[PDB]
Amino acid sequence: TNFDQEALLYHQQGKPGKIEVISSKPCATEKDLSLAYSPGVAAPCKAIAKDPAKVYDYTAKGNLVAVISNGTAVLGLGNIGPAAGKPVMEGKGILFKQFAGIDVFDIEVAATDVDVFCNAVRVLEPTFGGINLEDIKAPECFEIEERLKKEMNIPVFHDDQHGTAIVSGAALLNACSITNRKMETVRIVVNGAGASANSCAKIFIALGARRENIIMCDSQGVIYKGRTAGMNKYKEYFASETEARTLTEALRGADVFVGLSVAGALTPEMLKDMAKDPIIFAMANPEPEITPDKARAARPDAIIATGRSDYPNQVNNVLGFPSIFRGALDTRSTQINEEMKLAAVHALAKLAREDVPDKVSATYGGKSFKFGRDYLIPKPFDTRVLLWVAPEVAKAAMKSGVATRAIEDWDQYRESLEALQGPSKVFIRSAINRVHQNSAANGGELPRIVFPEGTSTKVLKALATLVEEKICQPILLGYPERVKEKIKALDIPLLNDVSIVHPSSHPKYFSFVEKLYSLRQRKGINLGEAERLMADPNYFAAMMVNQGEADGMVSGSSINYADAVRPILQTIGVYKEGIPAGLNFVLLEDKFLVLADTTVNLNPTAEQCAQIALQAAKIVEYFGIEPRVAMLSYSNFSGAEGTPRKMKKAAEIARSLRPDLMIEGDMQADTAVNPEIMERLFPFSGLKGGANVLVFPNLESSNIAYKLIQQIGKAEVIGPFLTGVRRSANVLQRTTTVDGIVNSVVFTALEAQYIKEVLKS
Amino acid sequence: TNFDQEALLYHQQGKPGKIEVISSKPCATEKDLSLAYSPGVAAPCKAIAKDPAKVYDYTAKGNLVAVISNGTAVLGLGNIGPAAGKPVMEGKGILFKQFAGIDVFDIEVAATDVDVFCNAVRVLEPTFGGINLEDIKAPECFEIEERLKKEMNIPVFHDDQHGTAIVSGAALLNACSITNRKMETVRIVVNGAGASANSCAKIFIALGARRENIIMCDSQGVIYKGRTAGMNKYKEYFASETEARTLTEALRGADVFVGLSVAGALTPEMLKDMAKDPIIFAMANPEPEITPDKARAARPDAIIATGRSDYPNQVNNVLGFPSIFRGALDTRSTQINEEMKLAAVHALAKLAREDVPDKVSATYGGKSFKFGRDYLIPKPFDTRVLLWVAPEVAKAAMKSGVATRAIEDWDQYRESLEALQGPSKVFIRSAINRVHQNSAANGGELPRIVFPEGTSTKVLKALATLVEEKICQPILLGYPERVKEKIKALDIPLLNDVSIVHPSSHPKYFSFVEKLYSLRQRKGINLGEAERLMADPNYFAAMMVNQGEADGMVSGSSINYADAVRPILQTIGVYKEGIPAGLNFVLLEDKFLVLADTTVNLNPTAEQCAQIALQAAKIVEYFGIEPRVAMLSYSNFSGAEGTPRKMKKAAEIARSLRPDLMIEGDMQADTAVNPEIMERLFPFSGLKGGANVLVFPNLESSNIAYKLIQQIGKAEVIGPFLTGVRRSANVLQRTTTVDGIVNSVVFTALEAQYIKEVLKS
């Protein structure tokens, strides 16, 4: 197949393999290496000698999980060797890292004797914080893990053994709550005796199922006690008292079919004879025991789940292990025990019922999902999985006493969990915590924010995520029923209760058209034009804000930047000495840089540049950071006629206005951001410690700079945001994504709170 | 100590540990993971099943080396455990990666029985391409490696056993060539019986030393045959027929002292009694058997070497293992054998004699080094090490038959080796190969290039590296003896034979001042001013170029950009329709982007922007790449009055001039570089596949853009370079580093060849 060859080149091209190792600390100099190695590395070693625990503080143990296998059960290809099994392992590690931020070593072992293999593995224990076995044959595997969990004082976990059980377990919980079943009256039939089969029962049972109501099958029919044909010590756990000997006889009147075998194993004939509301987990690969459509054909009352990505309810293990190993690892647990595996099932099934975020609908091509028969388990790609599962896993490991380190700030824990991908995401979270902070100080009151484009798909979808973060109270504009149509159209019930206002219909409408009239009658407006402009949701919004009928507004999700910025300016205006200006954030590992003005003024004058900068400094001072400002130029201090003079004189004005602040010009870009270049070449410069605020000499330089950093800099950039207006106001771009719309709203809310506080004085 | 605590926070802060694992292939989408894992990963596995060899083609084996230890000998702290020994290992891996680009897993093993440990290690063989043991006690270690090298069909190597031997071995070779000794008449005394001692002899001997002339000591004196006090099976290798029982009796008349013990072990008394020209390797840590100054005190004829970084001849293993494992790994060798270890000693000692590059002098604070008594071995930080050692290691492994894959293009091999750090470095190497390519087609003739600032430290030092790459024939300007003074002052004898010209003294001087006269008498020059301006090296250079007395020039390593660009323009001029323009390269993983004009024109007109671009396209077409051009703006196609109109009309002109080329405007930045944004929003745009040539609307935008990418983009940027002049000419900045000066010269040479070729037509 072309797909086969595409896989081959994926692995082969460029750097062969799928993994690489890098340093987590600087490693450039005589000094850097004199820290990471001799003579420096002695200091941690000695400290680990005196207290072994500290091995987690100075080393990578705390995040290092080994994926180990002998390649005696790779995927569905079986015992194909340790060599051929390696890529699958590299990949399993990739999954670890991408889904829970966990670093992983692939270890391919050449021993098929249970004892060689264990004697080899157990002695790796100081290396890893946790051990993930994968793709090892039955029944050897059971002997190996059962032994190892006992042997080693770190967690040991065979993913193929327990994953399927945990996800299909959460799934069963849900289906059972759905169909009003009780676990203790559920009959469960397991066809198949692979790695997974044995643990499925352990778990359903652990969730409350009666083992008498559980029948288990293999390639030779029902497993009845005393059957000797093809048994091992481990299958012997779940033999039934039943007289049924064929699968079919077992599935007669059965409530749930746990299908762990091959396709076609489940006939429409057996389906006709299962209980009312049959729960069917057909997880055979690549093809299920029966297709969902063929099953809905025999019994429309059937609930169906597979491991395939193109059918509903994809049962993929990745819902499981990453979140789990994570939670374990963070508490420095000694095991992954049953308390924990169950806590994980309970978390997955709990998360499943929450309204499906538009980020997730997005991952799967806009398809809407609601908790039900077609959504039993969170989609494998929910970014919330980790946030919901890992903390409960740690919570369990602490409650069960296998943990050696206690997590106290739960919220903090989750925060770090989000933080895992996104140096920007962390920033917006700081931001939101800081909205909540002065929110709760002024009565828990939330800033009122109007969204003129009330039928905007993107604005709505953003709002959705917005409310459960309790950022703002949303007011949309348009015809109330033509927007509730779009809320019901987007399956977004999160926000069924928000204010929806038609301009022309609102009581203060006329009071408004009069107030616009006097503000603009001598600027080209008669009494008629003000009536018709106030009918524009934008002008209606702004006027709402100016009068205090709302604390802020945001639009421009549908309109050109300009077209959307003008009514704001004509209604709200700027405060004394203000200038309208667009500002960006560039987010690095430590600091962030502020870029302006990137949307508004075409070729700003010196006075104007000094004001842009001063505002940018009030904004950075808001976050408790010392603002450092550079008026950018093509020259290093020339004062030459033209741009340099404008910028030099600009900085001079800015200092004239705020003498406590470090401000300079004119200077090139690199000369700005880098304090080393500054001290080496222009030691006279008042700017040291590198600039954190970059003012551009004109619009060409700033728009090209910000969009070029965004595309090439591979550092993350948010914005642009609007500044300098009398009231909390902000313009989006049409190209704005939903994320953009929600953080933009956050800033709007904050500045609003800041407006209220400037009022209090 | 404050240093101890600084080490602690180095390891503890941010992400605990010192290592992380990432993916080497994209991993973002349903598609990305459907390749790296199921169902895709089946395709490599099946392929490895049919031919095991292919495990190197689709997996990370080919670059994966395990550093393994039980922590029974960590540094000088001894048997402190597998746990405490981990950080030292993480660090050893860091070294692997940083010095030879080798990925490394740290494996800390809890077994002190030779047999547990080996039985555990050998079964890891499918995982790694090679095995590095480190810091394991004697004599267990000998049993373990001696066993393992036999056991496993991948290389096994205990670094502490052989490193010291290999580096101190190259070092001995040199000292022996220096003092005109022959190995077979050398007497060698080894004090100490650590890991290293045993292999030292193996190697000196393998280099030609007679074992009868070798005496070996430990904590109980000389090792004589039959002494039973404190022996093991392995010390028994090198017992001597000698009657000396104390160290002192051994060192009487000894030629070389191999000191592997503790400080003070070597008295001035014993020193008085060693042979003429005593070679002293005192490598005890942290303090040597004797300080170099205390040793030079007793015997000034003594050659001395330590493992300390602040004394000459630092013997650090890093000269050894990285280069070695590299060369092995690339040939898919089954061992690291003696043929190879020796080939490595021969490479290190050969490299030691090459003139010391200014990059290396730079690493150590400008100190100059020449092969001699104070430089026996390349400095640990020579970037050449790898380039010289690894290919010879592979060469040996192929000649000795332990290899399973043959390297043919040796040059290519080295090229890739350089390439290892530097996506820009690879580019300049392409460039140089391409200078050599049309050089060898026009008679091996090299472009003549004049360097007016002939006393420039940086220009000289650059030239040094330049010649051995045979790029150009350098002509310097200044007073001949005042520059040969600076060549002798910089210990840079590489270039003792280059043309050195005083302007005023040269025969064509007057012919020149006359030709300047008529070119500029009606532009403010009398006959006198031309005499005195031609006395300026710059004008002298340019005039040399204009007349064909040289093929090109470069300066501005000392002068302001402008001040240095003016004489060029006044003498050489531009060709028909030319515009003077500064251009940069941005280097990514695949493509590169071209930025202009970043130094010259302040606010270029439309006609001018179209010409800047056209030139930039001749330049990108030169490298066989399809040029894609965007006239950058703050707008997406507004044609609005102002910048957008200028740029839109600009592109329109550029197409009017070269209709085969993909050129567009006006457009924002991101809209340019990203073909996806282009197809989604402006599908009408003639520009698809993302822009690779970015023309700026003015100087503010371009200087701020390029210097901002350089500082934040963390993609690499070279330049600025000069374009559009009639002849090969180029201006440096004062801030230019030596690297900058040498690649700048390369381009100058090339354009010169391109000038010659345009002439041929």
Residue numbers in the entry:
A (entry chain A), B (entry chain A): 16 to 776
Extract from the study:
Bacterial hybrid malic enzymes (MaeB grouping, multidomain) catalyse the transformation of malate to pyruvate, and are a major contributor to cellular reducing power and carbon flux. Distinct from other malic enzyme subtypes, the hybrid enzymes are regulated by acetyl-CoA, a molecular indicator of the metabolic state of the cell. The larger ME isoforms (hybrid enzymes) are predicted to be a fusion of two unrelated enzymes; a catalytic N-terminal ME subunit and a C-terminal phosphotransacetylase (PTA) domain. The PTA domain is homologous to PTA enzymes (that interconvert acetyl-CoA and phosphate to CoA and acetyl phosphate), yet they appear to lack critical catalytic residues and thus acts as a sensor instead.
We used our Br−/urea protocol to successfully obtain a full-length apoprotein, MaeBapo, from which we were able to determine a crystal structure at 3.70 Å resolution. Despite the limited resolution of this dataset, the electron density is readily interpretable, with good refinement statistics. The structure was not solvable using the MaeBbound full-length model, necessitating the use of isolated MaeBME and MaeBPTA search models, which results from large conformational differences between MaeBbound and MaeBapo. MaeBapo preserves the hexameric D3 symmetry of MaeBbound, but completely changes the placement of the ME dimer. Loss of acetyl-CoA causes a dramatic change to the ME:PTA domain relationship, mediated via a remodelling of the L1:L2 helix interaction. In MaeBapo, L1 sits directly under L2 (helices in the same plane), replacing interactions made by the hook region in MaeBbound (helices ~120° apart). Thus, the MaeBapo structure reveals a requirement for L1:L2 complementarity, with hydrophobic contacts at the interhelical turn (A434:V441) and polar contacts along the helical faces (R444 and N448 to D426/E430/E433). Dyndom analysis reveals that the apo to bound transition is represented by a 69° relative rotation of the ME dimer, with a 3.4 Å translation that pulls the ME dimer away from the PTA regulatory hub. Resulting from this large-scale rotation, the ME hook subdomain is freed from the clash with L2 observed in MaeBbound, and is now located under PTA d1 where it is able to adopt a helical conformation identical to that determined for the isolated ME domain structure. The net effect of this rotation is to “pull” the ME dimer into alignment with the PTA dimer, resulting in a thinner/streamlined hexamer, 74 Å wide versus 90 for the bound state.
